[PDB]
Design a binder for this molecule. Structure first.
Ligand SMILES: [Cu+2]
Ligand SMILES: [Cu+2]
Ligand SMILES: [Cu+2]
Lengths: 30, 30, 30
């Protein structure tokens, strides 16, 4: 339940990390 | 107490999400 | 253990906050 929903959370935070780095790269390659 | 301060936390993270999207938009409309 | 690893976490989130502000400043001073 809980430990799982924390893992589901680490999932989306890993994404969110990657997405912000991509958005920052793309601003610089614009 | 705890469940409340977690909700107080989801509050500020929602903001923080919006603020970063606004800062990224504004860089592109600059 | 837990309270400590939460504090270790607040550590890295403070950083992460500063790092994103620096990356945004530097895009604007580019
Ligand atoms: Cu993070
Ligand atoms: Cu987030
Ligand atoms: Cu944050």
């Amino acid at each position: 339940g809980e430990i799982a929903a924390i893992k589901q959370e680490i999932a989306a935070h890993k994404k969110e990390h990657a997405a912000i780095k991509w958005e920052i790269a793309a601003i610089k390659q614009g």
